[PDB]
């Protein structure tokens, strides 16, 4: 066969150890899920440094903890602007997930609290910014570079899916790069802890699986489709399906056709044809052998999955880092004030 006896034995033992890990990790997750942490700090514990982002619901600020000197990213959501935007459930759920998960490629919620008017989530500051900026600057990543990131997403999805969590918003914009060059996944507002099927139209057009576009009940296989889109975009510098308008994007997604740049390796094209598979009964990640069809694919032949998990692999790229508190990998915003002074439904925060 393909594997000699010693190689088959080592692979089998590796897969059983993963199962042992996931069992223990689901037990830890459920304990925190059932008994979340609340109000582990307060606003005056922090100095405001810089606004890193803003939107209709709130802003994200670089803050420094006054006593430890540690920098954090503080998400500030205004309770009234969330209640009046149909986002209460997503915000409660995102905080519930973040305080319960534990994985080396998920940004860590360090503190959370609320005051009279705002919700606050204080997470470890990831100073390298989004993969998006680096990808657009460099143009495209080499296949070994793309594989380094892809392997982390594979493990992160393997973790989340074992918790019955579908992630649903994979894209370079949501992948932060830390000081060791590893990925930190941000944003769990669209994630849903559901076995079986779910129906919500959500995600980003370029990354939508066909079954989402087609108004089907769908399952965790949409995350594996999105991995195919991400691997393609990392290696090509542009996603597999694009157009002027989303409706034209959706027609290409559902057509079951994808074209590859001539520099894509044969192994990469084969992996991507199996992830960007419209037919659910044939899409990798969704078959009898689960994630192992992906981890055992030829394109990942050189990947030491445990070494990736242990963060022992030297990253192919380390963002420039002029020290703690460096803001250079983020844009510049007007520094609006944070004023205090909607208890209903936010009781659980």
């Amino acid at each position: 066969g393909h594997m000699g006896n010693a190689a088959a034995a080592k692979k089998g033992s590796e897969q059983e150890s993963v199962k042992e890990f996931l069992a223990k990790a689901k037990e830890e997750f459920l304990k925190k899920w059932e008994s979340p942490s609340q109000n582990t700090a307060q606003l005056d514990h922090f100095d405001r440094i810089k606004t890193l982002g803003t939107g209709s619901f709130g802003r994200v600020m670089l803050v420094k903890h006054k006593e430890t000197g540690n920098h954090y990213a503080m998400k500030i959501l205004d309770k009234q602007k969330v209640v009046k935007l149909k986002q209460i459930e997503h915000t409660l759920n995102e905080k519930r997930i973040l305080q319960a998960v534990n994985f080396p490629f998920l940004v860590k919620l360090e503190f959370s609290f609320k005051d009279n008017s705002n919700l606050y989530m204080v997470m470890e500051y990831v100073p390298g910014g989004e993969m998006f900026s680096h990808l657009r600057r460099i143009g495209r990543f080499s296949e070994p570079h793309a594989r380094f990131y892809a392997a982390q997403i594979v493990l992160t999805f393997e973790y989340l899916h074992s918790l019955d969590l579908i992630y649903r918003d994979l894209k370079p914009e949501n992948l932060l790069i830390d000081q060791q060059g590893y990925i930190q996944v941000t944003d769990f507002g669209f994630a849903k802890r559901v076995k079986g099927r779910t129906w919500t139209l959500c995600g980003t057009p370029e990354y939508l699986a066909p079954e989402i576009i087609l108004s089907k009940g769908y399952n965790k296989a949409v995350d594996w489709w999105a991995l195919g889109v991400l691997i393609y975009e990392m290696a090509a510098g542009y996603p597999p399906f694009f157009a002027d308008q989303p409706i034209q994007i959706y027609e290409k997604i559902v057509s079951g056709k994808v074209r590859f740049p001539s520099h894509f390796s044969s192994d990469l094209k084969d992996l991507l044809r199996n992830l960007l598979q419209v037919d659910l009964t044939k899409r990798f990640g969704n078959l009898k052998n689960g994630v192992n069809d992906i981890k055992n694919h030829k394109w990942f032949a050189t990947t030491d999955w445990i070494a990736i998990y242990q963060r022992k692999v030297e990253a192919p790229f380390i963002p420039k880092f002029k020290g703690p508190g460096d803001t250079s990998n983020f844009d510049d915003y007007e520094e609006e004030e944070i004023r205090v002074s909607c208890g209903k439904e936010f009781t659980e925060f």
């Binding site: 989004e130 998006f132 657009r136 918003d169 894209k171 914009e173 669209f190 139209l201 959500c202 995600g203 980003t204 057009p205 370029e206 939508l208 510098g237 542009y238 694009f242 157009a243 002027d244 989303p246 074209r259 740049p261």
Partner: peptide
């Protein structure tokens, strides 16, 4: 070319969710 078509798409910047 595909790269040229990508630039022409106007979808090279950060993409919002639906």
């Amino acid at each position: 070319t595909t790269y040229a078509d990508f630039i022409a798409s106007g979808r090279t910047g950060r993409r919002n969710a639906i």
